[PDB]
């Protein structure tokens, strides 16, 4: 479909018969516009006290993100976890609740196209708990740019249990905005990602929010092929089979290769 799908080598798996079928992916974002003809939202929950409906995306964020998961893993079961409000901001508690819901709800993949500058013990316990449970936890690295020799990587992405996804363009080049550091795991396409928008729309968005779902989507592709495989197995598969870009501080392991990861 869109360039980022080809880039990650997704199509090669679609042809072979691997589309993410029977994989449960939670999008912990501003909701998903379930009304979108293309989007099949299987369920969800809201943790935003003022925004009761998970299936309503007042931002556009969550709908775009969900769209990306679906283009990579078209047969995957999408779950909308509303943690962010119309403004794009959310409480750490709302987020924790969203992680907890995903665990309790037997999610296979968590997508967190979100990040903050500071962490919490409650945050780390939650993410680490998702991992202990067998969930593949995906998060954007952040859009912090550089800070000399300092890690720019936001939370929950900073955490080792969480796959930290940075951004590349269609030329395999690091996006200027892309958070850097030892904590950066993988690179996925995040420059001008054309996806689903609320109210039967499509539009381009840039950021690590865009890169993350490509990995969340890639993870669902591997689980469709290897149903038996642990989160640990999925993650290793992804990280170990990458297209090596520059330095690890900037690129991590490089670009994901869904085709090589699926063996």
């Amino acid at each position: 479909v869109p360039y980022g799908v080809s880039q990650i080598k997704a199509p090669a798996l679609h042809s072979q018969g691997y589309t993410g079928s029977n994989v449960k992916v939670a999008v912990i974002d501003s909701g998903i516009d379930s009304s979108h003809p293309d989007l099949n939202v299987a369920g969800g929950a809201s943790f935003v006290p003022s925004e009761t409906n998970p299936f309503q995306d007042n931002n556009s964020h969550g709908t775009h993100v969900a769209g990306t998961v679906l283009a990579v893993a078209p047969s995957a079961s999408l779950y909308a976890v509303k943690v962010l409000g119309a403004d794009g901001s959310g409480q750490y508690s709302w987020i924790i609740n969203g992680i907890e819901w995903a665990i309790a709800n037997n999610m296979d993949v968590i997508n967190m196209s979100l990040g903050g500058p500071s962490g919490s013990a409650a945050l780390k316990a939650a993410v680490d708990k998702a991992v202990a449970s067998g969930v593949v936890v995906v998060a954007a690295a952040g859009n912090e740019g550089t800070s000399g020799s300092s890690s720019t990587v936001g939370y929950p992405g900073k955490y080792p249990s969480v796959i930290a996804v940075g951004a590349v363009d269609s030329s395999n080049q690091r996006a200027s905005f892309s958070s850097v550091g030892p904590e950066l795991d993988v690179m996925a396409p995040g420059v001008s990602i054309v996806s689903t928008l609320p109210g039967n729309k499509y539009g381009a968005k840039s950021g690590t929010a865009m890169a993350s779902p490509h990995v969340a989507g890639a993870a669902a592709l591997i689980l469709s092929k290897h149903p038996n495989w642990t989160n640990t197995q999925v993650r290793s598969s992804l990280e170990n089979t990458t297209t090596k870009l520059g330095d690890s501080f900037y690129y991590g392991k490089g670009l994901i290769n869904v085709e090589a990861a699926a063996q």
């Binding site: 974002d29 962010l84 794009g88 901001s89 959310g90 990040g115 903050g116 952040g142 929010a209 865009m210």
Partner: peptide, 4 residues
Amino acid sequence: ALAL
């Protein structure tokens, strides 16, 4: 936490 903010949208990425």
